[PDB]
Amino acid sequence: MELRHLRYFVAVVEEQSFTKAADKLCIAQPPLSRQIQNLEEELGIQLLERGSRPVKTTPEGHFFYQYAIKLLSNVDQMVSMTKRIAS
């Protein structure tokens, strides 16, 4: 699992759309969908209700989502601070 998977997943959850998330991340929809599938397959879980319109998380999916946003925020803080040290 990579940060890309988390960033893609968060965008899908927030936009409630695979296409709209793809637009926001400046990528095509098909690879985005494949990456989220890859994430679910790696974890051995369903993060999203399959076939849900608009896109809705499963309970474990929403749990994962809430911790994913926390982690991505921490990444941003880490990178920002480390850069500020060197400059």
Instruction: Give 56 or 70: the residue with its C-beta nearer to its own copies.
Output: 70
Q: Are 48 and 55 in contact (CB under 8 A)?
A: yes
Q: Are 29 and 12 in contact (CB under 8 A)?
A: no
Instruction: Give 20 or 56: the residue with its C-beta nearer to its own copies.
Output: 56
Total residue count of the chain as it appears in this document: 87
**Residues 2-31 as x/- pattern, contact with Na ion by CB under 5 A:** xx----------------------------
Tell whether residue 74 is a contact of its own copies (CB under 8 A).
yes
